[PDB]
């Protein structure tokens, strides 16, 4: 053929994603990234409001632990709760890459998708924010729990990390 498969088939040149990539991604990412999730393949059909993020990554309801349907009727360990983390986390990637695509090409305009518009505003605040999980903006505080997952998790076999590492196979 006209080219070789070595950059994808040989471990001496293959440049795959690292566990620290997702931690820097939402802060300092360059305008030439290739992980950009497209609406034709992204599970955006499973979308939520920023307040429901607190149902899969828990925040205290009060000092007495006053339980609710989101913890007592349908616990955080349910398989459907994991789908909601995966689909929302993949959109934090889209919202950081979509804003960069417009910076790289002034002839086009960013998404009309309210979830993309929501997350790109949160990411541009969260990079300068100092309270994080304690921030008084519900959208900032909720997104910081998602960012805190990749910062503390180091496993290969995790219901959130495994499908992301499988999708980010940039060999
Ligand atoms: Zn977008
Ligand atoms: Zn904040
Ligand atoms: Zn994990």
The two counts, helices (H) then strands (E), for the chain are 8, 0
Cα 77 to ligand 1 centroid, rounded to whole Å: 30
**Distance from the alpha carbon of residue 68 to the mean position of ligand 3, in angstroms:** 25
The range of the structural domain enclosing residue 18 comes to 1-171
C-beta of residue 48 within 8 angstroms of C-beta of residue 84: yes
3-state secondary structure the chain: CCCCCHHHHCCCCCCCCCCCHHHHHHHHCCCCCCCCCCCCCCCHHHCCCHHHHHHHCCCCCCCCCCCCHHHHCCCCCCHHHHHHHHHHHHHHHHHHHHHHHHHHCCCCCCCCCHHHHHHHHHHHHHCCCCCHHHCCCHHHHHHHHHHHHHHHCCCCCCCCHHHHHHHCCCC
Q: Is 135 annotated as a binding residue?
A: yes
Q: How far is the CA of 104 from the centre of ligand 3 (A)?
A: 32
Q: Are 88 and 123 in contact (CB under 8 A)?
A: no
CA 111 to ligand 2 centroid distance, Å = 23
Cα distance between residue 143 and residue 130, in whole Å: 14
Question: What's the structural domain count of the chain?
Answer: 1
CA of 110 to the centre of ligand 3 (A): 30
67 is in an annotated binding site: no
User: Whose atoms come closest to the Cα of 102: which ligand?
Assistant: 1
The technique is: NMR
Would you say 94 is a known binding-site residue? yes
Q: What are phi and psi of 112, to 5 degrees?
A: -95, -5
Q: Say how many Å lie between the CA of residue 132 and the centre of ligand 2.
A: 5
CA of 49 to the centre of ligand 1 (A): 17
Centre of ligand 3 to C-alpha 150, Å, is 6
> Which ligand lies nearest the alpha carbon of 151?
3
Q: Crossing angle, helix 114-126 and helix 79-104, to 10 degrees?
A: 80
DSSP 134: G
Q: Is 128 annotated as a binding residue?
A: no
């Amino acid at each position: 053929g006209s080219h070789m498969e070595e950059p994808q088939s040989d471990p001496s040149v293959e440049p795959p994603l690292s566990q620290e990539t997702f931690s820097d991604l939402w802060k300092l990412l360059p305008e030439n990234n290739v992980l950009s999730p497209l609406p034709s393949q992204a599970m955006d059909d499973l979308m939520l409001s920023p307040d429901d993020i607190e149902q899969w990554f828990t925040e205290d309801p009060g000092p007495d632990g006053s339980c609710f349907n989101g913890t007592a009727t349908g616990p955080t360990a349910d398989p459907e709760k994991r789908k909601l983390i995966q689909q929302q986390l993949v959109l934090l990637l889209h919202a950081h890459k979509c804003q960069r695509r417009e910076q790289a090409n002034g002839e086009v305009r960013a998404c009309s998708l309210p979830h993309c518009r929501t997350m790109k505003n949160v990411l541009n605040h969260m990079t300068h924010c100092q309270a994080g999980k304690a921030c008084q903006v519900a959208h900032c505080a909720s997104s910081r729990q998602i960012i805190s997952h990749w910062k503390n998790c180091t496993r290969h076999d995790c219901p959130v990390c495994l499908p992301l590492k499988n999708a980010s196979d940039k060999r």
